[PDB]
Amino acid sequence: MTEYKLVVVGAGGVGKSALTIQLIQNHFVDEYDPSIEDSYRKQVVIDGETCLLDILDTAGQEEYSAMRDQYMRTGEGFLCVFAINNTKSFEDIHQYREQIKRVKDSDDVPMVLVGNKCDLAARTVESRQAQDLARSYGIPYIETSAKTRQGVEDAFYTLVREIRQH
Ligand SMILES: Nc1nc2c(ncn2[C@@H]2O[C@H](COP(=O)(O)OP(=O)(O)NP(=O)(O)O)[C@@H](O)[C@H]2O)c(=O)[nH]1
Ligand SMILES: [Mg+2]
C-alpha cells in the first residue's frame, strides 16, 4: 500500500470540503466541523492497485499561509475545485495554481481541475473556459457534484494518475 497525500484547495464554497467529506464519509455537510486539520485518509484501488488516499482538507482562506507551506510541501498532488455556477472560483483557482509552482518550485506538478456543482441549473463558466485552464496547465478536467454525487470519485482518482505519471 502507498500513501497519497491529496492536498485539496478551494476559495471557500467551491466544494473543496464537499468533495473530501464525500470521498470519505460520503454525505452532504449539514453540521460538520467548519474547516479543520482533522484530515482524512481512505483506502482504495487505482486500476487494481490498492493504495491509501490521504485527502487533506485545509481552511478556506482564513489567514494561514504559513501552514500552507507545510502541507503543500508534504502534498503529493493538488486538486483545484471550482464551481461552474460560481465564476469567483474560476478566479481563485487560477492564482491557486501559482502558489503550488512556488512551493514545489517547478511548473511540472501533479494536479487536477474538477468542476463541482455540476447539478445546479445556473452555470456561468462553461466547460470551454474550464478546459482553457486544464489545457493551458496540461492537467485533466473532470466534472462532479457534491449534491447529486456524480463522478465524485472519478475526480479524485484522476489525481492518483497524475502523480503516478510523475
Ligand atoms: N447546490 C449545491 N451546493 C453545494 C454543492 N456542494 C456543496 N454545496 C454547498 O455550498 C456551500 C459550500 O460551502 P460549505 O459547505 O460551507 O463548505 P466550506 O465553505 O468549505 N466550509 P468553510 O467555509 O467553513 O471552510 C455549502 O452549503 C455546501 O453544502 C453542490 O454540489 N451543489
Ligand atoms: Mg471548507
Swiss-Prot record:
Q: What is the effect of changing P34G?
A: No effect on interaction with PLCE1
Catalytic activity as recorded in UniProt: GTP + H2O = GDP + phosphate + H(+)
Known activity regulation? Alternates between an inactive form bound to GDP and an active form bound to GTP. Activated by a guanine nucleotide-exchange factor (GEF) and inactivated by a GTPase-activating protein (GAP).
Q: Which CDD domains match?
A: H_N_K_Ras_like
Clinical note on disease = Costello syndrome: A rare condition characterized by prenatally increased growth, postnatal growth deficiency, intellectual disability, distinctive facial appearance, cardiovascular abnormalities (typically pulmonic stenosis, hypertrophic cardiomyopathy and/or atrial tachycardia), tumor predisposition, skin and musculoskeletal abnormalities. Congenital myopathy with excess of muscle spindles: Variant of Costello syndrome.
Return the motif ranges for Effector region. Answer: 32-40
At which residues is S-nitrosocysteine found? C118
Please give the residues the UniProt entry marks as glycosylated: S35
Q: What are its E.C. numbers?
A: 3.6.5.2
Q: Which family does it belong to?
A: Belongs to the small GTPase superfamily. Ras family.
Q: How does it assemble?
A: In its GTP-bound form interacts with PLCE1. Interacts with TBC1D10C. Interacts with RGL3. Interacts with HSPD1. Found in a complex with at least BRAF, HRAS, MAP2K1, MAPK3 and RGS14. Interacts (active GTP-bound form) with RGS14 (via RBD 1 domain). Forms a signaling complex with RASGRP1 and DGKZ. Interacts with RASSF5. Interacts with PDE6D. Interacts with IKZF3. Interacts with RACK1. Interacts with PIK3CG; the interaction is required for membrane recruitment and beta-gamma G protein dimer-dependent activation of the PI3K gamma complex PIK3CG:PIK3R6. Interacts with RAPGEF2.
One GO process term, biological-process aspect = regulation of cell cycle
Molecular function as annotated in GO:
G protein activity; GDP binding; GTP binding; GTPase activity; phospholipase C activator activity; protein-membrane adaptor activity
Report the subcellular localization: Cell membrane; Golgi apparatus; Golgi apparatus membrane
Q: Which GO terms describe its cellular component?
A: ciliary basal body; cytoplasm; cytosol; endoplasmic reticulum membrane; glutamatergic synapse; Golgi apparatus; Golgi membrane; GTPase complex
Effect recorded for E37G? No effect on interaction with PLCE1
Main localisation: membrane
Q: Which UniProt keywords apply?
A: Acetylation, Cell membrane, Cytoplasm, Disease variant, Glycoprotein, Golgi apparatus, GTP-binding, Hydrolase, Isopeptide bond, Lipoprotein, Membrane, Methylation, Nucleotide-binding, Nucleus, Palmitate, Prenylation, Proto-oncogene, S-nitrosylation, Ubl conjugation
Q: Which residues carry this modification: N-acetylmethionine?
A: M1
Name used for this protein in its record: GTPase HRas
Q: How is it modified after translation?
A: Palmitoylated by the ZDHHC9-GOLGA7 complex. A continuous cycle of de- and re-palmitoylation regulates rapid exchange between plasma membrane and Golgi.
The impact of changing D119N is: Loss of GTP-binding activity
UniProt membrane topology term: Lipid-anchor
Modified residues annotated as N-acetylthreonine in this record: T2
Effect of changing C118S: reported as:
Abolishes S-nitrosylation. No stimulation of guanine nucleotide exchange
Q: Which domain of life, per UniProt? A: Eukaryota
